[PDB]
Amino acid sequence: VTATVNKADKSKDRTYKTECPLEFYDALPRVGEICYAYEIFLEPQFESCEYTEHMYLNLQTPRNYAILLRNKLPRLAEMPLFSNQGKLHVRVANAPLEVIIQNSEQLELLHQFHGMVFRDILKIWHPFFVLDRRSKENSYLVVPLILGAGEQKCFDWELMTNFRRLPQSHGSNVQQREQQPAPRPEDFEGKIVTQWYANYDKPMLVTKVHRELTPLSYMEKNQQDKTYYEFTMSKYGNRIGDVVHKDKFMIEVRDLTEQLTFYVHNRGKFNAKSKAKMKVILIPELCFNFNFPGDLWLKLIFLPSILNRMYFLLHAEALRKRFNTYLNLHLLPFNGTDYMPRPLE
Amino acid sequence: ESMEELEALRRKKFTTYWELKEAGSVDHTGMRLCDRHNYFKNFYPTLKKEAIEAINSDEYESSKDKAMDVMSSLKITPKISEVESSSLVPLLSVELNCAFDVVLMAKETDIYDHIIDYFRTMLI
């Protein structure tokens, strides 16, 4: 304290080694061991409207995912998030789902799906990213969850084995169009699609199919004297080559935001009426179809923010328990096993 | 023509030479450097009106999409390459390949909005 050595470097900073919460250390599920799954629920606060239905109804879908650990999680508080449509509420299941891993290949399938989500769906991937099995720090897993018999919920095995990697979209030519089977309205309903002709290869969620609307029909607005087919040719004739399956059904699709960090309330003049009036109509065989359902994609999009917030809430819980035990106040009903977390203010 | 041919023929030859040497750096806009910035202003209204309508449109899905649509509107071809850098986030440069030698560069999270700002400023 009396030394003059550190008087000059007053406003410097220091580097520190971060450490995961104890729950997220050695959390990699193991064969022959009991593992716990915590379903993550999301509740939209904003009203469902022409600017918001595709997010509201999709979030309220019963299909969800869960976090899988060897280490039991404590109770966690309700969590707010801010999407473009409005404020969003997130919670973690207080009652873990418990299953047993029995063979290596099932764990490999789980880990493959976990890697695929970040590599393709979120595009958090880097060239130097490698999957880890050391069961060292930050080794928890993510598993999609599908409703089981009755009220029970179970793992979506077919989804994981079907999507070890996302299929690359490709531009089929006219002969490829002819040899391919006709599009089916049910195979598109609720699925993720992307356009393989234009530079816009980014995915989108089709809200619903329009089986009653076919090419040569006049459009919605402005160019009401023009038809879908003629505009598609005039726009991208040199890209598409030609159109096959002329008389088939059309679809109406809405876009998926690229944001990942929804902590802070993004604000602006969203012009909901005009943003709804730009009703995007696309030709099915002109846009590649993923079998991946959007009711899981619009919830996987929020995964990074939730994971980071949980990463820090676990440290907050650890500190709270340490202090309440140190002061000998832990035996109180306020701080005991009946500890009820309160939503973040 | 005696002096005119001596000028035009070597113009063609040297312009082709520089175009094959560098793919850019060839100035054939015909405008004085004191006023070469008026290049984007002096296009036909056909491209300009629709380009400014696109760049003024707020419904666009993303800044990248807006940039690509505006650039395609002026029929100007893109050219994006990765410049070497010490930054973890890649440092990307964009070349427009038009007669006016123009190049822009930033982080790839900002290159599209940078193109938005550039074409917003120039197109009037």
From Swiss-Prot, chain A:
Keywords: ATP-binding, Cytoplasm, Helicase, Hydrolase, Nuclease, Nucleotide-binding, Nucleus, RNA-binding, RNA-mediated gene silencing. It is found in: Nucleus; Cytoplasm; Cytoplasm, Cytoplasmic ribonucleoprotein granule. GO terms for molecular function: ATP binding; ATP hydrolysis activity; ATP-dependent activity, acting on RNA; deoxyribonuclease I activity; helicase activity; mRNA 3'-UTR binding; ribonuclease III activity; RNA binding. Disruption phenotype: Abolishes RNA-induced silencing complex (RISC) assembly and RNAi silencing activity. Abolishes siRNA unwinding prior to loading onto the RNA-induced silencing complex (RISC). Decreased levels of endo-siRNAs. Increased susceptibility to infection with RNA viruses such as Flock House virus, Drosophila C virus or Sindbis virus. No effect on the processing of pre-miRNAs. RNAi-mediated knockdown inhibits the induction of the antifungal peptide Drs in response to M.luteus challenge. Also highly susceptible to infection with A.fumigatus, with 80% of flies dying six days after infection. In ovary (at protein level). The keyword DNA-binding does not apply. Its main location: nucleus. Residues 24-166 are annotated as: Platform domain. Residues 186-240 form the PAZ domain. Double-stranded RNA (dsRNA) endoribonuclease which cleaves endogenous (endo), exogenous (exo), and viral dsRNAs to produce short interfering RNAs (siRNAs). The generated siRNAs then mediate gene silencing, also called RNA interference (RNAi), by controlling the elimination of endogenous transcripts from mobile and repetitive DNA elements of the genome as well as exogenous RNA of viral origin. Also acts in an RNAi-independent manner to activate translation through cytoplasmic polyadenylation. Belongs to the helicase family. Dicer subfamily. Component of the siRNA-directed RISC loading complex (siRLC), composed of at least Dcr-2, r2d2 and Taf11, which processes dsRNAs into duplex siRNAs which they then load onto AGO2 to initiate formation of the RNA-induced silencing complex (siRISC). The Dcr-2-r2d2 complex exists as a heterodimer and heterotetramer, with the latter showing higher siRNA binding activity. Interacts (via N-terminus) with the siRISC loading cofactor r2d2; interaction is essential for formation of the siRLC and consequently, formation of the siRISC. Interacts with Taf11. This is Endoribonuclease Dcr-2. The lineage of its organism: Eukaryota, Metazoa, Ecdysozoa, Arthropoda, Hexapoda.
